[PDB]
Structure formats: structure tokens, C-alpha cells
């Protein structure tokens, strides 16, 4: 049952989300003061650094969860489950955090508000801030449903190129499966159109890159 493999990766997302939608939107009129944002460029790059890097490890967590709770992701063996992980897990948090960025102001939810990118500052990376932004714009654009991210973001997750896997046929296995669940609902919704749209694999890759590891010290 396909339908049954799209109802599952549905409600793990749902379970999964972090921030419901509802809020994200009914938040986007609470926008960072001059002075709060003046905050924040004020503290050291160390300090925000720390603070963003709690907020990812945060963010990895629930990727994490929203993977087991994928029917079959428990099935395939512990060093498989890890390499995908280890691969995808902040991809997906990129992904996901086009939900909480509105197109309208170019503003992201940041610690309770809206703020756009000069906010962020203080980490001294700006074209880095500036690409996640760019990136979340673009994902904007395609008016994702839920559902739409939910089989998305799997699909991110489960990919059977990811070097080291042990059991690769497995992964296939898998990854066929979650295509056809999103390629059937995507032609039912005549949504085809986005597929196009997506970004290349290698853009999220190139993101997903040597200032985000080795964070330990933080
Ligand atoms: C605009 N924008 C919104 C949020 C936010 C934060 S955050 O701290 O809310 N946030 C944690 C999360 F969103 F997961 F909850 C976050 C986001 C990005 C990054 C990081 C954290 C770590 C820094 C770089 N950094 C990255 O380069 C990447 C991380 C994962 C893939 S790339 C930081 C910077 C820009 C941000």
C-alpha cells in the first residue's frame, strides 16, 4: 500500500513539524524592533554561533524523529539509518525552514519574531546568510503544500547515492517507493510543475557545507 506510505509520512511530518504553520503565519506581524535587531548585531560572533547552533541541533532532533517514524526507515540496518541521517538531516532542516520565511518582507521566525537578514550579523557569514535566504525565497515560491513537503523532505532524506551505505538495494528499494507516492499525488493535483522548480541536488549539498560541522565547540 503506496497510500499507506504517503498517510505515514504525512503524519510523521505532522507530528514532526516543529512549528505548526498556523502560528508561522499568524506571527508574520511580529517583526524584530530597530533596537532588538541592534541587539543581536551587538552580541560576539561566538555568542551567536552557540545560539544558532543550539537552535540547529534542535531542529536535527526532530529530523531525526520524523525519520524513524518513516515506515521502513526502522527496517533498514543502524549504520544505513545513520549515513542517511548524517547526509540529510540538516538538507531537510534547510528545507524546512522555508515555512517560517515570508516572501512578502524577506523576513525569517527567529526566537519568537520576524527579521530579515541583517539580523544575523554577528555570525560573520554573510553570503552564507545571504544563501539561505535566497534559498528559502526560492522555495517560497513553490507554495508547498504539507503534504507536498512532507514526501519532499523524505525523498531528501532517503536517497540511495549517499556513499557508505551497506545496504544499498534496501535504500532503492525505498526511495522507489517514496518517488512513486510523490510522482502519483504530484499528477493527481496536476502539481507536476514543481519538480522542474526544485533545486538542483547539488545546490542543498553545496549549502549543507564546512560551516555547519564541527559545531562540538559550541
Ligand atoms: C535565516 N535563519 C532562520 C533561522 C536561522 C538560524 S537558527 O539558529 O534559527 N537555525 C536553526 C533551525 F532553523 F534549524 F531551527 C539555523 C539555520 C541555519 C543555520 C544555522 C541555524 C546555524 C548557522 C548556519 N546555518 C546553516 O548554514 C545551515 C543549517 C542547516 C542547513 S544550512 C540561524 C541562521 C539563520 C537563520
Given at each position: 500500500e503506496i497510500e499507506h506510505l504517503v498517510q505515514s509520512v504525512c503524519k510523521s511530518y505532522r507530528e514532526?513539524?516543529?512549528?505548526?504553520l498556523e502560528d508561522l503565519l499568524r506571527q508574520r506581524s511580529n517583526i524584530f524592533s530597530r533596537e532588538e535587531v541592534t541587539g543581536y548585531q551587538r552580541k560576539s560572533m561566538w555568542e551567536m554561533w552557540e545560539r544558532c547552533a543550539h537552535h540547529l541541533t534542535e531542529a536535527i532532533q526532530y529530523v531525526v524523529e520524523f525519520a524513524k517514524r518513516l515506515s521502513g526507515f526502522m527496517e533498514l540496518c543502524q549504520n544505513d539509518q545513520i549515513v542517511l541521517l548524517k547526509a540529510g538531516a540538516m538538507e531537510v532542516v534547510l528545507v524546512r525552514m522555508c515555512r517560517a520565511?515570508?516572501?512578502?518582507?524577506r523576513t525569517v521566525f527567529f526566537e519568537g519574531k520576524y527579521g530579515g537578514?541583517?539580523?544575523?550579523?554577528?555570525?560573520?557569514?554573510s553570503e552564507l546568510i545571504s544563501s539561505i535566504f535566497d534559498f528559502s525565497h526560492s522555495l517560497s515560491?513553490?507554495?508547498?503544500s504539507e503534504d507536498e513537503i512532507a514526501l519532499y523532505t523524505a525523498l531528501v532524506l532517503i536517497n540511495?547515492?549517499?556513499?557508505?551505505?551497506?545496504e544499498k538495494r534496501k535504500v532503492e528499494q525505498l526511495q522507489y517507493n517514496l518517488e512513486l507516492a510523490f510522482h502519483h499525488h504530484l499528477c493527481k493535483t496536476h502539481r507536476q510543475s514543481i519538480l522542474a522548480k526544485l533545486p538542483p541536488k547539488g545546490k542543498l549539498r553545496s549549502l549543507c557545507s564546512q560551516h555547519v560541522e564541527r559545531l562540538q565547540i559550541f
Open positions: 514532526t513539524c516543529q512549528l505548526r520565511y515570508n516572501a512578502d518582507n537578514m541583517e539580523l544575523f550579523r554577528a555570525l560573520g557569514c515560491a513553490l507554495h508547498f540511495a547515492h549517499r556513499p557508505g551505505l551497506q
